[PDB]
Amino acid sequence: AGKNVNVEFRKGHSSAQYSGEIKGYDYDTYTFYAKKGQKVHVSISNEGADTYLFGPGIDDSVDLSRYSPELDSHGQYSLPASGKYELRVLQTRNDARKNKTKKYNVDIQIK
């Protein structure tokens, strides 16, 4: 299926970049540990690839994509709890069902 990757930042830096490609129902998971109140910002090159956040203090998931109402004016989301979070990159059920593919570059920033 999709891949599961542990997010690692270069020491002293606050973002990492990854590339992937999801097909059909495959979704990629970028896992990270962070502290309550730290802010996450995710940008992705392909808007056909949804970007949802799962983790502690989150009911279901939070839409982190650029037009999501969950973000502030800086495109950031404040983590509600400390612990292990998952950023999932996936397609819509429609595109999944139609066996489409999404090639993407994702940037994950945590401050």
- In this structure, what CATH number is given to the domain that contains residue 6? 2.60.120.380
Which of 80, 82, 38 lies closest to 62, judged by CA?
80
* Separation between Cα atoms, residue 96 and residue 101, nearest integer Å: 8
Tally the residues of the chain. Answer: 111
Which DSSP letter does residue 24 get? T
**Is residue 76 within 8 Å of residue 15, measured between CB atoms?**
no
Query: What is the SS3 assignment for 93?
Result: helix
- The angstrom resolution of this structure is 1.8
**Is residue 66 within 8 Å of residue 111, measured between CB atoms?**
no
Domain span including residue 20: 1-111
Split into its structural domains, the chain has a count of: 1
Contacts of 13 (CB under 8 A, 6+ apart): none
Solved with: X-ray
| Per-residue b or e along 16-32, where b marks 16 or more CB atoms closer than 10 Å to that residue's CB | bebebebeeebbbebeb
* Separation between Cα atoms, residue 73 and residue 77, nearest integer Å: 10
**Is residue 2 within 8 Å of residue 26, measured between CB atoms?**
yes
Residue 31: enclosing H or E segment and its boundaries? strand 28-34
Bridge partner list, 6: 31
* Separation between Cα atoms, residue 64 and residue 75, nearest integer Å: 8
